Amino acid sequence: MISLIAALAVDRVIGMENAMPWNLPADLAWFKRNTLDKPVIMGRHTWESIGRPLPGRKNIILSSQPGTDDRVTWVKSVDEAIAACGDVPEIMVIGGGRVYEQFLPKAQKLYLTHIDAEVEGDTHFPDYEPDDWESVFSEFHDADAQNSHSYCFEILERR
Numbered sequence: 288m289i290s291l292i293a294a295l296a297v298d299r300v301i302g303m304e305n306a307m308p309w310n311l312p313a314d315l316a317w318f319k320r321n322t323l324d325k326p327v328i329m330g331r332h333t334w335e336s337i338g339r340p341l342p343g344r345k346n347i348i349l350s351s352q353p354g355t356d357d358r359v360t361w362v363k364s365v366d367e368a369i370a371a372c373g374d375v376p377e378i379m380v381i382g383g384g385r386v387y388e389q390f391l392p393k394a395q396k397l398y399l400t401h402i403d404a405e406v407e408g409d410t411h412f413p414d415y416e417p418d419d420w421e422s423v424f425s426e427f428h429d430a431d432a433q434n435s436h437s438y439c440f441e442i443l444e445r446r
């Protein structure tokens with residue numbers, strides 16, 4: 288099955304031209320936990336912002352152009368990305384906006400981090416209808432000396 292993992296602020300904002308104005312190490316540990324040892328699919332833009340291959344994961348990059356890094360797998364379409372994943376229990380789609388939009392309709396689970404932050408952004412997670420999903424797990428956390436804003440982890444299963 289296919290799952291999407293994303294961190295969203297209010298208004299579903301997930302990205303902007305500059306780095307996000309937040310520091311959430313706990314959210315990053317959550318991302319790592321949920322993605323280790325699974326293939327992760329991402330768009331070229333996301334790849335660039337990440338900067339290097341995520342360790343302990345099969346990295347698949349979507350791009351209309353020829354790949355520029357032989358350490359990861361590059362594909363030219365959604366179908367080819369799925370196939371490059373092989374026979375695995377769970378495929379994780381890590382963004383960005385374009386990518387999420389194309390995989391949402393095919394996903395069975397969403398791992399979302401809701402951040403209590405208002406930011407101007409130019410990229411949004413796709414709108415989803417709550418009633419179409421079941422919240423199977425949720426856990427709120429307040430900001431702390433290490434995390435700049437409060438946040439909530441939620442796992443949704445498609446009904």
Ligand SMILES: NC(=O)c1ccc[n+]([C@@H]2O[C@H](COP(=O)([O-])OP(=O)(O)OC[C@H]3O[C@@H](n4cnc5c(N)ncnc54)[C@H](OP(=O)(O)O)[C@@H]3O)[C@@H](O)[C@H]2O)c1
Nearest residue numbers: 293294302303330331332333349350351382383384385386
């Ligand atoms: N807060 C979060 O959870 C989170 C998670 C991920 C990303 N983000 C952010 O979101 C941004 C990136 O989102 P984005 O929408 O701009 O970019 P994106 O989805 O990462 O990448 C878009 C690129 O992927 C390729 N692509 C997408 N669909 C394709 C398809 N069907 N076939 C071939 N290539 C395809 C194209 O690459 P070419 O241009 O090379 O053709 C396209 O320009 C950044 O701000 C980033 O930090 C946030």
Ligand SMILES: Nc1nc(=O)c2nc(CNc3ccc(C(=O)N[C@@H](CCC(=O)O)C(=O)O)cc3)cnc2[nH]1
Nearest residue numbers: 292293294314315316318319337341342381382400
């Ligand atoms: N929950 C969630 N939070 C995010 O920040 C997020 N970011 C992306 C894309 N951007 C990134 C940026 C950096 C790293 C990153 O460096 N991750 C390392 C973490 C090392 C650590 O724990 O700092 C990794 O190994 O996962 C991952 C995705 C996709 N889904 C998300 N999902």
